[PDB]
Design a protein around this ligand. Structure first.
Ligand SMILES: [Ag+]
Lengths: 92, 92
């Protein structure tokens, strides 16, 4: 039982899409996040290819729930749905 | 006298801001362009930091003239100011 909470993931290359926005919040809450090297496999490239555009902010992944990325990740932090998000990751 | 024309430059990292737009035209005209590794020095980072936003298209540099980037680079190609641009690089 290393962590009663869940594991968060983020779709972004190792430095250059500039995912400082997604980390900006995670840093303020000392939350955990896992980077994903894209442009390497058709499984990820195809996925990010859909949420890609103007090399906008990266995408966030919480458990079995999808997230638009920084836009939603930040939106929830404001409304007050980040706690239960980084703990479970619900869409409600 | 390797080239009676001038030298063009573009501000963008080595694959990841996705500068396919700027190259898209340069490729159609077989023009020359020089890439610039940003996020390495405060001299360039600070510059691009001003023309940066939503990871929009990169910036173009012609001789002693500044260019918004793909927006202007393409605009001129339409109006008919790309020839004298890649040859001298004027603002008129
Ligand atoms: Ag990169």
């Amino acid at each position: 039982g290393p962590g009663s909470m869940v594991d968060v993931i983020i779709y972004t290359r190792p430095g250059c899409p500039y995912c400082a926005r997604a980390k900006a919040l995670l840093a303020r809450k000392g939350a955990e996040f896992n980077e994903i090297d894209a442009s390497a496999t058709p499984e990820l490239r195809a996925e990010m290819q859909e949420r890609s555009g103007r090399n906008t902010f990266p995408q966030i992944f919480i458990g079995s729930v999808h997230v638009g990325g920084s836009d939603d990740l930040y939106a929830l932090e404001d409304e007050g749905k980040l706690d239960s998000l980084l703990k479970t990751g619900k869409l409600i």
